[PDB]
Design a protein around this ligand. Structure first.
Ligand SMILES: NC(=O)NOCc1ccccc1
Ligand SMILES: NC(=O)NOCc1ccccc1
Ligand SMILES: NC(=O)NOCc1ccccc1
Length: 284
């Protein structure tokens, strides 16, 4: 069924809350035993948001391999994403270790450091060229190379150096700075523009490791970003783009990380983004 009219059928009936609860009811439940070990309590921002054991990213160290991060592998779309929480004061070194070990080209950030007067994640990247960051616990160095500030997002070029080998890589930081403190954007125009800028960079492409995507918990805004991208890629690839069922793509993604799309408003916004993104590509 074409999703514009279905969209219109849910909107006219006002059943967004009822669709969203059906998804929550059918979603996968797998164990998260490593996340709940007592040694890992200060590595988790939220007690109710954990990576599943089968899909968690492992750090390449013998001490403690745990980070709150999951690999979302979409087989038919041929895309992979790492979804993770906003780094904590004691996990900033782990975060950059993961970016290095997984060979990521891009980091996508969908939140501000402060929202609603509270800290949503650590200041994990340098703000001035001449004041670089060193993480002694994971032996890495991070330098701001350049910054391009626009109205809805900022793009930064960073240099990440493995102090053990003296190898360096360029990491692109894509920071969406205008998601509102409450609710979802009114138009998906600036979110779709942002997504097309990340694609243009090469960050989502198979010649690199998976892109790292985060918000505060790494399930709501982060969920919206990977659901919209995968759905539009499938519409490009299949003979009949109407076959593409956003609710079925979301349930497949929820086999890899719990809780993706946190509210009925985020579900409606996801539909809007895919429809408009489809209409802008599919002709007019
Ligand atoms: N140069 C340097 O040591 N920077 O500290 C990095 C850092 C640690 C914890 C939270 C945010 C940033
Ligand atoms: N603590 C620890 O052993 N971390 O290993 C990760 C790491 C660090 C530097 C360069 C490459 C990998
Ligand atoms: N880009 C692309 O895949 N175009 O062909 C699909 C299409 C576009 C507009 C109207 C109907 C079908």
């Amino acid at each position: 069924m074409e999703m514009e009219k279905e969209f219109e059928q849910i909107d006219k009936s006002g059943s967004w809350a009822a669709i969203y609860q059906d998804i929550r009811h059918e979603a996968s439940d797998f164990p998260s035993r490593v996340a709940k070990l007592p040694k890992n309590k200060n590595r988790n921002r939220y007690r109710d948001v954990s990576p599943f054991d089968h899909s968690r990213i492992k750090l390449h160290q013998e001490d403690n391999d745990y980070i709150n991060a999951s690999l979302i592998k979409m087989e038919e779309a041929q895309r992979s994403y790492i979804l993770t929480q906003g780094p904590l004061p004691n996990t900033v070194g782990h975060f950059w270790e993961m970016v290095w070990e997984q060979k990521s080209r891009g980091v996508v950030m969908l939140n501000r450091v402060m929202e609603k007067g509270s800290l949503k994640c650590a200041q994990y990247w340098p703000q001035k060229e001449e004041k670089e960051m060193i993480f002694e616990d994971t032996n890495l160095k991070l330098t701001l190379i350049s910054e391009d500030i626009k109205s809805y997002y900022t793009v930064r070029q960073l240099e990440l150096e493995n102090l053990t080998t003296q190898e360096t890589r360029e990491i692109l930081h894509f920071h969406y700075t205008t998601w509102p403190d409450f609710g979802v954007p009114e138009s998906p125009a600036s979110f779709l523009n942002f997504l097309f800028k990340v694609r243009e960079s090469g960050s989502l492409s198979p010649e690199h490791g998976p892109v790292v995507v985060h918000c505060s918990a790494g399930i709501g805004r982060s969920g919206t970003f990977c659901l919209a991208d995968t759905c539009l890629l499938l519409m490009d690839k299949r003979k009949d783009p109407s076959s593409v069922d956003i609710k079925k793509v979301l349930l497949e993604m929820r086999k890899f990380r719990m809780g993706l799309i946190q509210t009925a408003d985020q579900l409606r916004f996801s539909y809007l983004a895919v429809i408009e993104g489809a209409k802008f590509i599919m002709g007019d």
